């Protein structure tokens, strides 16, 4: 099993910029390296084959180069349609292994999140269940920490989170965090906090809810 390494994991860039992704194989692959692009909901698309050869119909802005275990992929002038994921794959030995991927993102100014906490609806409580939601919207960069505290104690059981893709209009990221409890377990506590840590502030953004109010 040849292990494929990809650096960086994420690459923020501007339109028109020259962009370079790096690929590293665990052992010699004799130039048997492919580069693919992948966009949401679609199959991977081959861009480069045999380290540096441009696949048929692929735009001129794409290129590759590599010396044994080390390889690179270049976009000479970034287009908005190039925003997606890039994978390097060796076809020297089966099983053919794919790298983790490099996501290209649009470079942008730093942006503080807007945090909003929501109690379970009375309609849901009538069903015997209780879900608390917290929206952490329009932040940049992508790296954020969002946690639930219940009466001061960090709660992880029943917590789910998802992050949107980079916004088309403003290039920010948005996150929804959900804390699912039974009505009985929700009534067992009073203070519910959504605690947000982002590099835009040394102090945490804290939105609280008191079950009684």
């Amino acid at each position: 099993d040849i292990q494929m390494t990809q650096s960086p994991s994420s690459l923020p860039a501007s339109l028109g910029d020259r962009v370079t992704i790096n690929c590293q194989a665990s052992q010699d692959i004799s130039n048997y390296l492919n580069w693919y692009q992948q966009k949401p909901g679609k199959a991977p698309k081959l861009l480069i084959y045999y380290t540096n050869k441009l696949a048929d119909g692929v735009p001129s802005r794409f290129s590759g180069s590599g010396s044994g275990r080390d390889s690179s992929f270049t976009i000479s002038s970034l287009e908005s349609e190039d925003i997606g994921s890039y994978y390097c794959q060796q076809y020297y030995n089966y099983p053919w292994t794919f790298g983790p991927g490099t996501k290209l993102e649009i470079k942008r100014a730093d942006a503080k999140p807007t945090v909003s906490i929501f109690p379970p609806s009375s309609e849901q409580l009538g069903t015997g269940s209780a879900t608390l939601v917290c929206f952490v919207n329009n932040f940049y960069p992508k790296d954020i920490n969002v946690k639930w505290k219940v009466d001061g104690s960090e709660k992880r059981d029943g917590v789910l989170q998802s992050v949107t893709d980079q916004d088309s209009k403003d290039s920010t990221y948005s996150l929804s965090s959900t804390l699912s409890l039974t009505k009985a377990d929700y009534e067992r506590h009073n203070l519910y906090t959504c605690e947000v840590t982002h590099k835009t502030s040394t102090a945490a953004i804290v939105k609280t809810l008191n079950r009684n109010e």
């Binding site: 084959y49 048929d56 983790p100 929206f135």
Partner: protein, 210 residues
């Protein structure tokens, strides 16, 4: 020209089996080595199996060894993947592919969902609060199966300040939320209604915030 059409995908209970078929066209199928590749949600790509043109040599991923079986009908231009004793770890988009020295051809893919859950209509709940000069509202679309759901605001007229989040799977069921940010002077003087559709259960729900 060259076409690859997968079929057989769908929802499956854990431990049960499924047969994926891939129909080839626009090339001499019998003269090519064929591949099955999968992509798990949010995960990367993994090679599942390889079969030669004559079926002489067959190769598998260690994750699928002794559970999955590649076969081909060259007379009928068909590639098959017999997937047995299914685990939730096999939930992925499955692709049949032909790899040339300089070209690649992939099919559309078929989602294989390994779940002990059955078709469930979602529960739609309002998200209303209990300065920035804005107010955030939303909808919680809870415990539905299978994917997808479509969410909109005010019949699709309201797209500014909307964020529809990727769904999350828990206990076999999906949950998803959508947030809508509007200027605070505009709410509740101007109605905000989320419109949710779950085609699988034939669900169309509208929910006014407040």
């Amino acid at each position: 020209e060259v076409q690859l059409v997968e079929s057989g995908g769908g929802l499956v209970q854990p431990g049960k089996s499924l047969k994926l078929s891939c129909e080839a066209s626009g090339f001499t199928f019998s003269g090519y080595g064929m591949h099955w590749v999968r992509q798990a949600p949010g995960r990367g790509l993994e090679s599942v199996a390889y079969i030669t043109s004559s079926s002489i040599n067959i190769k598998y991923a260690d994750a699928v060894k002794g559970r999955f079986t590649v076969s081909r009908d060259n007379a009928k231009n068909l590639l098959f993947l017999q997937m047995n004793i299914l685990k939730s770890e096999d939930t992925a988009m499955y692709y049949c592919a032909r790899f040339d020295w300089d070209k690649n051809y992939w099919g559309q893919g078929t989602m294989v969902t390994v779940s002990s859950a059955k078709t469930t209509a979602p529960s739609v709940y309002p998200l209303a609060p209990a300065t920035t000069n804005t107010v955030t509202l939303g909808c919680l679309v809870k415990g539905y199966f299978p994917e997808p759901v479509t969410v909109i605001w005010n019949s699709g007229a309201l797209t500014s300040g909307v964020h529809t989040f990727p769904s999350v799977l828990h206990s076999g069921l999906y949950s998803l939320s959508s947030s809508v940010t509007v200027p605070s002077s505009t709410w509740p003087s101007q109605t905000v209604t989320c419109n949710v559709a779950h085609p699988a259960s034939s669900t169309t729900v509208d929910l006014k915030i407040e």
